[PDB]
Amino acid sequence: ISEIANAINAFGDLYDCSRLDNLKAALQKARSICDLPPFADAPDLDDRIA
Amino acid sequence: LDPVAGNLITATPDGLVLLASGIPFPDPSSVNISDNVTLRVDEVTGDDATADGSLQKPYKTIVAAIGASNAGDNIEVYPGSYAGNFAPKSDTTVTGRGFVYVDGNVTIGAAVSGVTVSGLFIDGNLTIAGANGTVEFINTTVSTSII
Amino acid sequence: LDPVAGNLITATPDGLVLLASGIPFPDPSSVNISDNVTLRVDEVTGDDATADGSLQKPYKTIVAAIGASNAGDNIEVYPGSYAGNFAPKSDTTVTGRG
């Protein structure tokens, strides 16, 4: 039980006892590139692209 | 007997009667002004976690707001202390109020133009490389060498 | 149903009816400061024909505010675009932020 819930809040999200797809939501957000934080400094020549 | 006009809140489900639950409040929001054009930064109350630049959810760090800035926006800061390197976006502005302290370096990125800064105490270098001109610094201090 | 004056429940030939429209919502706290001395102007959220210059309803055209201006009135303009000529009155200030 701990090893599940502890992973659910990996992205600072409240546990929801009324929903039975919480772990699903966390997995989805992981792939989403749209949610990554926007950078705020000039890129350097030694920074990698993916 | 319950009415059907829709001016009702006591719709009774199974069981004898409904009583009442959460009713449709209006939620009078606070004042909005230059919502997505001007941004606020603060340390006392801001929180970048859900910040929007509004007076009620101002950004907590300078680096956060600058990243979300759009061309023509205006970043307005408030007294306090802030940390983190950054580089203002092209066609933008930065304004200070009262004492302000910054812990980091500020760089004008390649091909940037139209920037404007004022009223800041920068505790680090200020690199200017690849710039395209049209810049203006005012009432600023640097603890190290401009380059 | 209780005869107390403050009772909200009501009855009609259709049945016992009640909507929030009959329930008074306490009025919100209007924010203002230097209300008649500080005439805010904002492109984003202004509305000249109904604006008073206050944060609640700031102007949208500088010219409109200036005409409404008074002695000592400060005309503050937020970043953006504007159009229209004008002629400021005596004892007045203008400050284009950003």
Side-chain angles (χ1 to χ4, degrees):
Chain A
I1 284 161
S2 297
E3 191 43 271
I4 291 297
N6 183 14
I8 292 170
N9 301 156
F11 297 157
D13 307 330
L14 283 72
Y15 173 86
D16 193 350
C17 75
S18 69
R19 281 168 47 225
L20 310 181
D21 59 357
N22 304 260
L23 174 52
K24 189 193 194 177
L27 212 58
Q28 272 182 331
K29 292 176 192 182
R31 197 186 190 212
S32 164
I33 313 309
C34 299
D35 298 290
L36 294 174
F39 200 48
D41 188 349
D44 305 331
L45 276 177
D46 289 344
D47 282 352
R48 306 173 283 151
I49 292 161
Chain B
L1 296 174
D2 273 8
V4 189
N7 187 311
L8 183 61
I9 304 161
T10 66
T12 61
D14 177 17
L16 265 48
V17 63
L18 170 85
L19 283 72
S21 64
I23 61 173
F25 289 108
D27 188 0
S29 74
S30 47
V31 180
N32 282 98
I33 185 159
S34 181
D35 291 336
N36 276 323
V37 165
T38 195
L39 305 172
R40 270 71 161 210
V41 193
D42 176 2
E43 176 175 23
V44 188
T45 71
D47 194 352
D48 290 343
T50 69
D52 51 19
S54 81
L55 298 175
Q56 296 68 1
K57 308 175 81 192
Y59 282 63
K60 204 178 181 63
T61 75
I62 289 164
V63 66
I66 281 169
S69 74
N70 305 323
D73 285 338
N74 180 1
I75 296 90
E76 185 167 319
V77 190
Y78 276 67
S81 187
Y82 313 84
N85 291 318
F86 60 74
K89 285 183 201 164
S90 296
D91 294 331
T92 46
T93 71
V94 190
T95 285
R97 317 171 81 82
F99 181 100
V100 177
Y101 182 102
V102 176
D103 174 11
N105 321 291
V106 179
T107 287
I108 304 304
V112 176
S113 69
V115 176
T116 288
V117 182
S118 67
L120 299 175
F121 181 107
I122 286 161
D123 187 1
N125 313 86
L126 168 55
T127 302
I128 288 169
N132 272 5
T134 317
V135 192
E136 162 188 304
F137 285 71
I138 303 168
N139 294 320
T140 301
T141 298
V142 191
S143 71
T144 71
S145 301
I146 298 177
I147 311 192
Chain C
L1 71 165
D2 190 299
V4 159
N7 195 354
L8 273 292
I9 299 293
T10 175
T12 62
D14 183 21
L16 302 199
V17 76
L18 171 55
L19 184 60
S21 48
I23 304 189
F25 294 110
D27 292 333
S29 304
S30 55
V31 186
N32 64 4
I33 187 166
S34 165
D35 210 1
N36 298 322
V37 173
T38 313
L39 313 191
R40 284 79 169 195
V41 186
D42 164 26
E43 172 176 357
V44 192
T45 74
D47 163 35
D48 300 304
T50 79
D52 56 12
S54 77
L55 316 186
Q56 308 303 149
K57 278 203 166 189
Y59 282 74
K60 217 179 196 62
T61 49
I62 58 184
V63 67
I66 291 169
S69 60
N70 318 323
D73 274 338
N74 188 358
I75 296 89
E76 200 164 315
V77 179
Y78 282 79
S81 169
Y82 297 95
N85 322 294
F86 60 86
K89 263 189 178 174
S90 297
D91 289 352
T92 59
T93 62
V94 187
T95 317
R97 293 156 65 183

